[PDB]
RNA sequence: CCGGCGCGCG
């Protein structure tokens, strides 16, 4: 009943990134 | 998404992407290299040079003061005087492109927008036959081109094939092929039946046919129906272009290959044009068709429809905005040519037409709608909905029959449960859970492939498109069976071309293995849903959707483990975007620090909705706590522990109270109001705006003639309300004078509250006077009351009609009273069985201290699962605590309660638990309305619409008949004439009541009939009532 | 019909409203008076008394 | 901009070697592990959890025994999950812990063994 | 104080 959802579990997908800093990484909106 | 669920928000994410990456250079393309008339002047674009640039504004700033989240386009420009023979080449500014949240969402002018995707037909050839007056088949083939354009080819009763257009202009094959240049001779060639075209040429037709230009002429004449013959130009070829061969022959990468598959043709994937083979060897499938060769087209199917996303959507917006600068820059061009001038290249383009094409899309287009934020549910659910209406999309009267229901190829991709309710039913569909977009607009669910010995088959999770569904055996059994022979040979239920089956697991090619495959997130957030009737899943997930974040929020003692999924992908929680330790937590933020980076993460704190719900969030995790990059820091509200929390855990029994539960009525006990269980924050927002008049602008202060100090005690002195001030109904918010007539903010009717957000803010513009803009937020405390509205997650809702003290409600054998009673009468109707289970495992849970999260259809396990898991968890809590009324052997699940009122038990044995009630936002205080008298229309003269606008309630022809079926003539007459728009009796009657002293007959017409005698003197006619006396037979004429 | 004693009403002084922060303290205005209103006390007697935090 | 979800670092056979016969200034923990091995998920996510609490006072890596299963034989690996603990000090001698070992086990072990 | 569009409730 106090158990807090570990979000890094096998049953999750993979972190979703920063949708901006997703963008800046791919390298298509410069700084 | 092969191994696990994916994130809800995962389609808005990866179209935005793909935007990105080629919507815009293949819209930046086609942007024509802009010439003037003397060619002395060419501008054009140099599109691989194109840039975005990170918005100035942060996303927090963004909505904070109403503006826009958009960035920043920067391509380059090449301006060419060949006058003067120099190149000047500058980083112009072409306009704003508007950038998706992580959760899918847009901001325009400080508003969250949602871009919902769009069902509609895929281009293709399709194939029709409907039946005459006389009942004679008639068959029919239509291409559907990539932008709608559909061309219907049909067979006459004298066999003739015309090329319809419109609904009267009508083409044959013959003046259509030769209008390409399809020479008379090798067009029979090339079809199987050569006499039936040559059986329908006149000789009339076949001089026309004889040459090119000529069919092109009379094709001309049968498509516009002009009178007169045409004169051939390269001006009529284009304008006949424009609306016919660009509108209705451009098939596109997706029209090419259905028409490959469809007509049977090895033709290359790059020819996107509708090429002349095709008319052809259509034509020879329609004959063919007709002589029981091959199987009509099915239109419902999904695997001929294609599904627009926010890709699509703001792609083609820029189809929209780059011609609308073209014809700016011709524009500037030319003026600036004659001026003779040299304009530099930032000059000849402004960002208006991209900025206000994107600006006015949310705005206005139907497909763009605000997100709906009541709670983290309703975020998520929102964009991934699926609609058949917007612009290029069938209507609610223009929807057919047929459309709305259910098709087999939706299984895994719509949800066959969630649909709107109204005349919207069907037309707005909703994506399963483990659902994707593929790349051709179809929708794909993942299926589990079953091969032979001799097969790599590294991944055996496919997903599967429905033009290939129909095709494969998918079963959804188990594989828990065995008689003497082995195990290939057991029978399981399968799927195979729109049917259902019993075959042998042998014959089997793919397994449904996922739980929570064919439903969507509301569907899938039900417990035991396998005993509900499918009715009242559609209920119950617009209820879910409904429920308001409470004060303090719990977690479900039992669930479906979705609820950590909501949670997540909602982003109401905070999410750790770094790995580190935690150094500091607080209220206002919370301090994360990782591989020598340190980071400050802010906590909203009592923020507004769009549906007057309150956000909040709480920290996670404590300092000195080591985190993952992607594990929780914060719950925000209606979360509790990275859970979606929309209600709470009460005690409540099933049985018939003194009529306090008649139909859907709910008995609730005093524990819930004094504790502070079901308790929200409502938050609304006043604005008021200061504009220019010609007697000069509004003016703000504290001073205001005509009003007391007690209504004005709660301003400062610039004149508004004071931080943190208890307003009440009529007091004053932001004091303001017109020149001076008062027209100040005040307080509506019920809004009484604590004010908690102030915004005195300008907004910078080019004028001499900026709008000033103030916001006033007040928070009202709601705890439950009588009319409130309570529902579970099985469709089970009502009302709530009487509270009572502790020791008036039924208590159990351990002495504690319930919480909530509810009529044991509305299960067997309405057919939801599942309550009933969590409710038992609900009780059991909290005697146990144990959660549960169980997933749909367990009894795919076994018989009776979900009984043998509640029956069993039952007994083990009343073994545990030595309670042995928690489990019955002699009635499972049901307890002897007593009486509060007597102290004498009740007869029959009542089913208890703890089971997870909501409260939603349908509720008394919002729904409460009065009216004496007061403000009319300006034209009908009758009372006004609408709770807010103080209206009066409408008596329409239905109820007109009532009154007629009474016989009270006189009831009806008041509410025809002096309560409604009778001018001169309307305030008789305000006089008469005031002094008591009777009312009498109008005896006059009312502004309504007087409104229609004008309208119809508007169309030169008179219309006189005219009084004839019983007793002298004078006529005279009623003022009218 | 047995009676309790307890706390129903605190002042405070530098708060706009309860549902405010204070600099320097863990707990919001809204968790003070929350945790004031978990406090159980014991009297005999009845009337207004008014005690202190200082 | 956008940080790495995994903070363990896949090593060769090869690479493996360097690495240990290089100097070293923290403590090296080496993981063998297989991915269909079902008790590998959880000691991949405990070793996450351990990379995290020692930022740069220890290095955690993993060899794959589908790429590296000779190697991993030869350092006398009789199953998985298998750790191998690998003291900076080249006189210390190395530890070898068989099974779903306590994060706070492995604290331990780098705390005080190391 | 006027109409369209979208979303809902019974």
Not at chain 1, 10 to 30: A, G, Q, R, W
Not at chain 2, 734 to 753: A, D, Q
Request: glycine share 8%; proline share 5%; with cysteine.
């Amino acid at each position: 009943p106090d158990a807090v959802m570990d979000f890094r579990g096998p049953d999750f997908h993979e972190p979703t990134p920063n949708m901006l800093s997703y963008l800046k990484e791919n390298c298509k909106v410069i700084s | 998404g092969t191994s696990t669920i994916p994130g809800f928000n995962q389609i808005q994410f990866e179209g935005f992407y793909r935007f990105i990456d080629q919507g815009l250079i293949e819209e930046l393309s086609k942007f024509p290299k802009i010439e003037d008339i003397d060619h002395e002047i060419e501008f054009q674009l140099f599109v691989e040079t194109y840039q975005l640039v990170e918005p100035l504004i942060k996303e927090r700033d963004a909505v904070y003061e109403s503006l826009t989240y958009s960035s920043e386009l920067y391509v380059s420009a090449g301006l060419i005087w060949k006058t003067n023979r120099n190149m000047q080449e500058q980083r112009i500014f072409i306009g704003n492109i508007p950038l998706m949240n992580s959760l899918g969402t847009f901001i325009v002018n400080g508003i969250y927008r949602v871009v919902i995707n769009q069902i509609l037909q895929s281009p293709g050839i399709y194939y029709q036959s409907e039946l005459d007056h006389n009942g004679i088949s008639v068959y029919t083939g239509t291409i559907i081109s990539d932008w709608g354009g559909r061309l219907e080819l049909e067979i006459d009763k004298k066999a003739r094939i015309w090329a319809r257009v419109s609904r009267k202009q009508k083409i044959s094959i013959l003046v259509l092929s030769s209008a390409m240049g399809s020479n008379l001779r090798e067009i029979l060639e090339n079809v199987c039946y050569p006499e039936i075209f040559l059986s329908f040429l006149t000789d009339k037709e076949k001089k026309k046919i004889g040459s090119k230009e000529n069919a092109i002429l009379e094709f001309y004449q049968q498509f516009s129906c002009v009178g007169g013959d045409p004169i051939f130009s390269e001006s009529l070829c284009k304008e006949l272009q424009k609306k016919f061969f660009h509108q209705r022959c451009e098939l596109g990468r997706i029209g090419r290959r259905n028409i490959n598959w469809r007509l049977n043709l090895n033709i290359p994937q790059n020819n996107i044009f509708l090429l002349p083979r095709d008319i052809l060897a259509a034509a020879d499938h329609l004959i063919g068709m007709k002589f029981g060769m091959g199987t009509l087209d099915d239109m419902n199917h999904l695997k001929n429809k294609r599904i627009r996303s926010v890709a699509d959507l703001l792609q083609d917006q820029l189809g929209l905005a780059l011609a609308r600068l073209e014809n700016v820059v011709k524009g500037t061009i030319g003026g600036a040519i004659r001026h003779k001038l040299i304009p530099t290249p930032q000059n000849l383009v402004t960002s208006t037409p991209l900025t206000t094409t994107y600006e006015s899309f949310f705005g206005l287009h139907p497909l763009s709608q605000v997100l709906d934020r009541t709670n983290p549910l309703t975020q998520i659910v929102h964009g991934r909905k699926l609609s058949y209406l917007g612009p290029g999309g069938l209507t609610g009267r223009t929807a057919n029959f047929r459309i709305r229901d259910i098709h087999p190829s939706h299984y895994g991709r719509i949800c066959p449960i969630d649909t709107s309710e109204g005349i919207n039913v069907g037309l707005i569909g909703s994506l399963s859970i483990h659902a994707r977009i593929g790349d051709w607009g179809s929708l794909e669910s993942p299926f589990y492939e079953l091969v032979e010995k001799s097969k790599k088959a590294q991944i055996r999770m496919l997903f599967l498109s429905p033009s290939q569904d129909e095709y494969y055996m998918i079963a959804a059994g188990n594989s828990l069976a065995l008689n003497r022979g082995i195990q290939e040979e057991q029978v399981v239920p399968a799927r195979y071309r729109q049917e259902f089956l019993t075959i042998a697991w042998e014959e089997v090619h793919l397994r449904s293995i996922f739980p929570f495959q064919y439903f969507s997130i509301g569907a899938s957030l039900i417990p035991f849903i396998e005993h509900n009737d499918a009715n009242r899943a559609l209920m119950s997930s617009n209820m879910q959707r409904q429920a308001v974040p409470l004060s303090r929020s719990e977690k479900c003692i039992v669930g479906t483990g979705l609820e950590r999924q909501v949670a997540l992908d909602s982003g109401v929680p905070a999410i750790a975007e770094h790995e580190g330790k935690i150094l500091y937590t607080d209220t206002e933020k919370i301090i994360l620090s990782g591989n020598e980076n340190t980071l400050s993460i802010p906590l909203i704190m009592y923020q507004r909705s769009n549906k007057n719900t309150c956000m909040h969030q709480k920290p996670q995790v404590r300092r000195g706590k080591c985190i993952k990059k992607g594990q929780i820091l914060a719950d925000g509200a209606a979360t509790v522990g990275g859970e979606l929390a929309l209600g709470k855990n009460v005690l409540v029994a099933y049985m018939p109270w003194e009529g306090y539960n008649f139909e859907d009525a709910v008995l609730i006990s005093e524990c819930l109001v004094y504790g502070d269980i079901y308790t929200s924050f409502h938050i609304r927002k006043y604005e008021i705006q200061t504009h220019v008049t010609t007697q000069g602008p509004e003016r703000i202060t504290k001073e205001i003639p005509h009003l007391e100090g007690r209504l004005l005690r709660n301003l400062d002195k610039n004149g508004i309300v004071m931080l943190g001030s208890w307003v009440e109904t009529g007091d004053i918010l932001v004091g303001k004078l017109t020149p001076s007539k008062e027209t100040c903010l005040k307080l509506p009717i019920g809004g009484r509250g604590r004010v908690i957000d102030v915004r005195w803010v300008q907004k910078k513009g080019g004028s001499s006077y900026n709008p000033e803009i103030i916001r006033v937020y007040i928070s009202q405390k709601r705890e439950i009351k009588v009319g409130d509205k309570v529902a579970g997650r099985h469709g089970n809702k009502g009302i709530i009609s009487k509270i009572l003290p502790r020791q008036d409600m039924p208590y159990l054998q351990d002495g504690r009273p319930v919480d909530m009673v509810f009529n044991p009468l509305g299960v067997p109707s309405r057919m939801n069985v599942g309550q009933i289970f969590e409710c038992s495992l609900g009780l059991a849970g909290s005697l146990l201290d144990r959660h549960y999260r169980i997933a749909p259809f367990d009894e795919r396990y076994e018989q009776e699962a979900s009984r043998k898991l509640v029956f069993s968890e039952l007994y083990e809590a009343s073994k545990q605590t030595a309670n042995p009324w928690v489990f019955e052997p002699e009635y499972p699940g049901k307890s002897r309660i007593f009486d509060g009122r007597t102290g004498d038990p009740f007869e029959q044995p009542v089913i208890i638990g703890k089971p997870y009630i909501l409260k939603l936002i349908h509720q008394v205080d919002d729904k409460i309305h009065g009216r004496s008298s007061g403000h009319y229309a300006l034209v009908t003269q009758q009372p006004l619409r609408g709770r807010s606008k103080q209206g009066g309630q409408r008596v329409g022809e239905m109820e007109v008949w009532a009154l007629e079926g009474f016989g009270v003539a006189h009831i009806l007459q008041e509410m025809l004439t002096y309560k409604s728009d009778h001018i001169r009796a309307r305030q008789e009657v305000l006089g008469t009541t005031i002094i008591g002293g009777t009312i009498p007959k109008p005896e006059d017409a009312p502004e309504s009939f007087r409104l229609l005698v004008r309208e119809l003197r508007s169309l030169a006619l008179e219309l006189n009532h005219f009084l004839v006396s019983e007793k002298n037979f004078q006529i005279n004429r009623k003022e009218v | 019909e047995i009676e309790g004693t307890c706390i129903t009403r605190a002042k405070f002084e530098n708060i706009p409203h309860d549902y405010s922060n204070i600099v320097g303290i863990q707990e919001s205005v809204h968790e003070i008076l929350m945790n004031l209103n978990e406090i159980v006390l014991k009297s005999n007697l009845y009337g207004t008394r008014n005690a202190l935090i200082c | 901009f956008v940080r790495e979800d995994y903070l363990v670092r896949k090593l060769s056979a090869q690479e493996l070697q360097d690495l240990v016969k290089g100097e070293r200034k923290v403590p090296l923990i080496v993981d063998f592990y297989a991915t269909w091995c079902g008790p590998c998920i959880l000691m991949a996510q405990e070793l996450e959890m351990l990379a995290v609490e020692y930022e740069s006072n220890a290095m955690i890596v993993k060899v794959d025994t589908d790429d590296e299963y000779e190697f991993a034989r030869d350092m006398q690996v009789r199953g998985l999950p298998t750790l191998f603990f690998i003291s900076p000090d080249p006189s210390k001698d190395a530890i070898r812990t068989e099974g779903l070992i306590p994060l706070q086990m492995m604290r331990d072990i780098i705390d005080n063994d190391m």
